[PDB]
Structure formats: structure tokens, C-alpha cells
Amino acid sequence: IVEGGPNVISIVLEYLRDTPPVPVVVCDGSGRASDILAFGHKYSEEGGLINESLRDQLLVTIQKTFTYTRTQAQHLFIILMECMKKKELITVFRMGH
Amino acid sequence: MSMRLEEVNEREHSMKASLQTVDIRL
């Protein structure tokens, strides 16, 4: 995965739910959707649970990077929980050798 | 310079989220 839109969020939810579990190596720094997945895994408690200030900051980044209105941002936060659930398949390529 | 400028950009990560959160608050 690099950068991507909300379409790659639904693609990640598809490929995660595929069994055999195709691991989603999400490359960082490219930004936009991979930055929602990246800042999710950067501050991930357990699976799709991330905290309140980071979830409504993510609502701002879905309302700006995706321009999805706040209800649809909570919708892609529900899909954020559903995708981030398999952090063992998410592999953050945070460069910064 | 490597550890100190590692500190500056990683701490302005907090400042970049701070201005964006105040934008939601305004």
C-alpha cells in the first residue's frame, strides 16, 4: 500500500478479510490514506481501538484528506476499526537505511 | 546534529497535531 484514497481503505478491508491472510505492508510518508492507517498503528491500543483525540483528529483527516463529511468519517472510522483489527497483517514501512 | 534534529521534527509532530486540533476547536 502507498498513500491511496478511501478506495484503498476498502481494498485493505477486503484483502485483510481474505483467508489466506494477505499481509498489508502499508508504506509510510506517502500520506493520505496510508497516513490514516499509519497514525492508527502508531497510536493503536489493541486492534481497532485508538483514543478519542486521535480518532477525531482522524475524523478531521478524513474530512480533509478524503473530504468525507463527519458522519462518513465516523463510517470510515468503523472501517478503520474493522481493518486495524488485524495489526498483525499491517506492516508499517516508517522510513526515517 | 543527527539526534538533535531527530528530536526537532519528532516534537513538531506534536506541534503539527496541536495546530490542527485547534483548527477543529475554532
Residue of A nearest to B5 (CA): A96
Contacts of residue A38, Cβ cutoff 8 Å, sequence gap at least 6 = A26, A28, A92, A94
What is the nearest CA distance from A8 to chain B, expressed in angstroms?
24
For A:31-90, CB contacts with B below 8 A are 53, 56-57, 60
Chain-chain contact of B20 with A56 (C-beta, under 8 angstroms): no
Residue at A71: amino acid letter: T
Contacts of residue A86, Cβ cutoff 8 Å, sequence gap at least 6 = A16, A21, A24, A47
Lookup result for grid cell 478491508: A13
Q: What is the dihedral of CA B7, B8, B14, B18, to 10 degrees?
A: 170
Q: Where are the alpha helices (DSSP H) in B1-26?
A: 2-24
- Contact between A75 and A64 under an 8 Å Cβ cutoff? The reply is no
Q: How far apart are CA A36 and CA A40, in angstroms?
A: 6
Q: How far apart are CA A13 and CA A81, in angstroms?
A: 10
* Distance set, CA B18 to CA A18, A19, A87, A95, B24 (Å): 38, 40, 27, 23, 10
Chain-chain contact of A60 with B17 (C-beta, under 8 angstroms): no
By what method was this entry solved? cryo-EM
Three state DSSP letters for chain A: CCCCCHHHHHHHHHHHHCCCCCCCEEECCCCCHHHHHHHHHHCEEECCEECHHHHHHHHHHHHHCCCCCHHHHHHHHHHHHHHHCCCCCCEEECCCC
- Contact between A91 and A26 under an 8 Å Cβ cutoff? The reply is yes
Residue at A65: amino acid letter: T
The alpha carbons of chain B give a radius of gyration, in whole angstroms, of 12
Q: Is A10 on the interface with B (CB under 8 A)?
A: no
Q: How far apart are CA A95 and CA A9, in angstroms?
A: 21
Residue of B nearest to A64 (CA): B20
Q: Is B17 on the interface with A (CB under 8 A)?
A: yes
- Contact between A84 and A37 under an 8 Å Cβ cutoff? The reply is yes
Q: How far apart are CA A20 and CA A31, in angstroms?
A: 28
**Coil, helix or strand for A91?**
strand
Resolution of this entry, Å: 3.9
